[model samples]
Target: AECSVDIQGNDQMQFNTNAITVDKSCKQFTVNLSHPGNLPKNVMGHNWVLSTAADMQGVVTDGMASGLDKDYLKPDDSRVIAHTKLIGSGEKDSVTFDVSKLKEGEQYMFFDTFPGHSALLKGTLTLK
Candidate 1:
């Protein structure tokens, strides 16, 4: 089975939801990220990045250094579990990650690495 998920980010520096679960029966998981506000990518851009909770900050820090062209994420960074292309305004993007890469008892963290947005646009993911 497959799990399809949707998350919303807005100009207010927030996400519509804060927690997500991944079903073990799923071969893959898909995340559909949408920005509902009218801001451009430079102003209020958002991208969804997934990593272990322990590695989240390091990924975000390195991603910030990687700059916008890299979508604020390091290229081929192994710590990244999955990520979607950055989008702004009414645009949308999605990422599909293999469920086999996840494990039970492990905690996943998801966040928008758009500059200051990290403070508010972060959440947790759990596999069961």
Candidate 2:
């Protein structure tokens, strides 16, 4: 089956779900992200960034340094499995990645890169 999922981020630093399963037959996976709050990108914006669970801290650390102009993500960081562009209220972004790169036993983490949001706006991705 094709792997695709949609998620929503709101002003309260919360996501619509805490987990997602990627179908085993998929060759690629897509993530559609939306923000429905009333704040702008710099204030209460949100983005969906994916990486191995083990790489979450390092990726987020460097991402914070990269700043908003870079969508709060490091430039060409290999640790990032996939990431959507940051979006503000009423805006949306999406990302697609090759499923072959994901290992079955490895855990995946998805989080909002907007400063201070990751604390609550994060989730897990598992291959099934």
Candidate 3:
């Protein structure tokens, strides 16, 4: 039942951790993202988005057009693995997904899709 992780986003557009691992014993995994900055959601919004490493660019590209209303993600985009809603200063959000959806050796990525933030806010996700 070891099924959760915590991540932090700061005003500098950074996440505290660069990687996460889901234990084999867990049937699901949860990601909690918190923003401790002093910026507003429009100016410094952050969200946690997961996808295959290869789909990162495309997801981000399409998300740019989706705008803040959709949490910067395209509506019903199947490429997204899991994601948290957009949040800002002192705000937080979480997302949980089935561990069986992940492949043992596949490389996955988690990132923030708030415009340019994606370049600086990204990380890896793995299944143990």
Candidate 4:
């Protein structure tokens, strides 16, 4: 728990939390996301994507254009700091990113990349 957070995504198109803070002492931070509902990936896929607040909309827009075959993300996009593969019902995925990438006082964002999921699954992240 000191270096990681666990998150959940459900069939209802929601993430369990709206905020996350990473302890500055952590050299690396991990986000573990799970899908607990019964919907298939094509219908209810979920993935965790991280970026600066200013980059979120651009990331999401391009990701949406890229489509599901690319996990709803641009290929090798520089704006994305970290991301996980899309997962479906009863599946799990995680992403680990350098803690140093986060500025202590700056706000970052995390959201699912499943096409329109960001409207309801977006969350904020910070470092302390």
Candidate 5:
């Protein structure tokens, strides 16, 4: 089976699911994010960003300056492990990253970089 997952972002400014597992047997893992609400990208956009827990704050802070066109993520930020483009209602995006980049005991976080959305859209990622 393919090692992939589908998650949703809604008008409530929340994600349908939190937390994800990356199987060691898989060479890569994919995260697909969908926005099912009726809002536009400017008002209620969502994206999936992956980084170390310690890097989360810095990434989000720096991303603020990059604006929505950059998917609210800093361009070429080395701290970002992987990410999906920002999307609005009825739209979707996906990101696939090498599984080997994750460490067993390290704390990794996945979240939306859309301003305050991270507070509710955040989740944990683990290597199993």
Candidate 6:
């Protein structure tokens, strides 16, 4: 199993894909987020965030209220299962977590924590 995937963020506020899957054979999983555009973090920052589909709204709200220094995520928010540091063009970050955190058939979601990025960033994840 690959056990890892790379997610790309661009200046247009879009992710390379809208879905991901984790293999049951893997014990841990990695998500790598990178920006290939030339914009700065303040203007177009991005971070890979994960949580239950139901918890997404609250998490994104608190995250948007946070500053870049906090990776744009609410501090101590348990709803966030895993996330990466905010990054700008030519930059990248990754997060690794235990595979057991995901439950098959549960509605899991992934998106960027930055403001106004809800347009093209939200996606689903599944345990296979």
In order, the Cα lDDT scores of the candidates are 0.90, 0.89, 0.91, 0.91, 0.90, 0.90
Error of 6 at 94 (Å): 1.2
Each prediction's TM-score against the native? Answer: 0.96, 0.95, 0.96, 0.96, 0.95, 0.96
For model 5, give the RMSD to the true fold: 1.1
Residues 1-128, candidate 6, lDDT per residue (tens digit)? Answer: 89999999999878998999999899999998899999999989988889999999999999899888887898999999988888999999889999999998898999888887865777998989
Expressed as tens digits, the lDDT of each residue in 1-84 for candidate 5 is: 469999999999788778888887999999988998899999898889999999999999988778987888888999999899
**lDDT score at residue 65, model 3, on the 0-100 scale:** 84
lDDT of 1 at 39: 91
The digit string of per-residue lDDT tens for model 1 on 12-38 reads 888988999998999999999999988
**Alpha carbon lDDT of residue 127, candidate 2?**
89
Q: Total clashes, candidate 6?
A: 0
- Rank candidates, lDDT, best first: 3, 4, 1, 6, 5, 2
The regions of model 4 sitting more than 4 angstroms off are none
Clashes within 3 Å, all models in order: 0, 0, 0, 0, 0, 0
Report the poorest 10 consecutive residues by lDDT, candidate 3.
13-22
Candidate 5, which segments miss by more than 4 Å at Cα?
none
TM-score: model 3 vs. ground truth: 0.96
Off by over 4 Å in 2: none
RMSD of 3: 0.9
Once superposed on the true structure, which residue ranges of model 6 sit more than 4 Å away at CA?
Answer: none
Model 1 ranges off by over 4 Å: none
TM-score of 4: 0.96
